[PDB]
Design a binder for this molecule. Sequence first.
Ligand SMILES: O=c1ccn([C@@H]2O[C@H](CO)[C@@H](O)[C@H]2O)c(=O)[nH]1
Ligand SMILES: O=c1ccn([C@@H]2O[C@H](CO)[C@@H](O)[C@H]2O)c(=O)[nH]1
Ligand SMILES: [Mg+2]
Ligand SMILES: [Zn+2]
Ligand SMILES: [Zn+2]
Lengths: 297, 297
Amino acid sequence: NAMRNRIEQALQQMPASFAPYLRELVLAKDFDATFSAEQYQQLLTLSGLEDADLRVALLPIAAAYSYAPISEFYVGAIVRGISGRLYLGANMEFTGAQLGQTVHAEQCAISHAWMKGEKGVADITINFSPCGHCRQFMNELTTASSLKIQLPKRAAKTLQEYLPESFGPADLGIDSGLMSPVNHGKTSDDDEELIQQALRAMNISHSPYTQNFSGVALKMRSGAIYLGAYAENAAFNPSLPPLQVALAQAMMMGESFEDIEAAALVESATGKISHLADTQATLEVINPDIPLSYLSL
Amino acid sequence: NAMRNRIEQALQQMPASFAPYLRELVLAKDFDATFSAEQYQQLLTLSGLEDADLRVALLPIAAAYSYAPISEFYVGAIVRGISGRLYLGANMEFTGAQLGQTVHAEQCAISHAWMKGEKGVADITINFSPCGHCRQFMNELTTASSLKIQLPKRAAKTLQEYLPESFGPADLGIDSGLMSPVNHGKTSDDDEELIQQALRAMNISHSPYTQNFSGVALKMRSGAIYLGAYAENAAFNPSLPPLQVALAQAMMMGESFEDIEAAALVESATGKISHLADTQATLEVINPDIPLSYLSL
Ligand SMILES: O=c1ccn([C@@H]2O[C@H](CO)[C@@H](O)[C@H]2O)c(=O)[nH]1
Ligand SMILES: O=c1ccn([C@@H]2O[C@H](CO)[C@@H](O)[C@H]2O)c(=O)[nH]1
Ligand SMILES: [Mg+2]
Ligand SMILES: [Zn+2]
Ligand SMILES: [Zn+2]
């Protein structure tokens, strides 16, 4: 885990009541930046705190994963999936790339729950009040109208309270299904294993506005492979490209971007857009030696 | 053309009270998608309507400028600068490019007001509720706290009502100054005139988070020149790149992007990001024959 040093700082400030148990979990080799419902129950019992208070108290663990070399402003978010599992996320910024390549903690935590199989978000606890871009991103979700947003000691609020008279999928005559299960059924006989992995990500992607179903697969020095599916948004700009999603999974799993050895991008030949130019440009600012395999299908 | 036809369609739907004078202004060979305070007052007197209802009535003139090859969803906006002059705007989409390149109507109308000299927005009128991305963009303005947002038959609202507990420049320790008077005073003895024009835009650009003061100049086959200055945002993703701004100015003057002959991008050597990759990639989906001159200053 490349972030353990910063995680240790966050742990050093955690209340004595639950720090030992949290430490045992977060410093474990395979810590995946998630907490099961059972582990959460144990944190509650041990902390003696009310639910909202405990989630807020855990935020620094999420913020410890922040990669913000442009702003040096560290944002952490905690998403409780509808299953009850908690998923951590942090913001990511890319020096030398246009700001549309930025990933917000909220987007990171939500993509983390989604790539791990959640069908929706129950609530999200955030370091700072969510910006309009994140509010709008959240409105694409299956649980847009039911999820709760929690800031420190403040009352929890629904998305609608943070984004009154919202614009969303409905306005483009489409249902709000980000996180709903899908299989686009795309198939390829390509012999490259990294392409086939990206294709699995493409097959669960959400792109009802451009039909550019797409995915990215990142192979690491360790041999691990991280997938990222495209999460498009009705307002267009809040869309989260597949690379950003893959990078987020790698980061939350404790990987260093300096350890990426290869990337693969797979997209739709009939998509109204392409992520190729931006995937290449962003990989170049990360490491110009990373080769990118590509397939339009 | 499609644009001329939509304008004609919009005109035919205007009440006879002011349609004849509106026609006269909108069909002028020099119409620049703006209405002077005087022209607007006269239209108001001819119409016998209340101020807010006339602005709403004029919305289809702005929407007629929409360039939406992806969604075919035409959004129009009318920004009233603090001078009293009205500036039209519409959404802009680019086939083959990542969605961060999209421009919302609200962004277009505001950048139009900004590029023509306005130091603040008094009010913005629109057909639909602004999405979160636009709300976040407006929160960067010098008049974020005083502007009004007008929708059809609804009372005017403040940005705070649409964006409660907002995130913005203050959270990053900075004043909200987009549209305030700016002169970075940068110079260059570069003998290329198009670079000199792009530098004029760069010298008024807004980039307090990355310091990538930047500008673009577009030259049409006719010889008309359009300038665009970078309008960065504290939420990062809602930042409006300089190409986008210049294309907005071209579009509101009635130009066709097929008629762009050359482009120039000027940015800062100490910027934490670069617009090069995305400027070349977007111009490429517009017309691969358009050359891009570049200077990192
Ligand atoms: O709600 C927000 C607002 C901002 N940020 C991050 O804060 C920095 C400045 O906006 C960027 O890295 C951005 O992604 C978030 O993660 N979430
Ligand atoms: O408030 C909004 C929401 C959406 N759009 C435009 O509508 C299309 C679909 O979101 C895109 O071109 C987008 O820029 C706007 O102009 N303003
Ligand atoms: Mg002020
Ligand atoms: Zn945000
Ligand atoms: Zn918008």
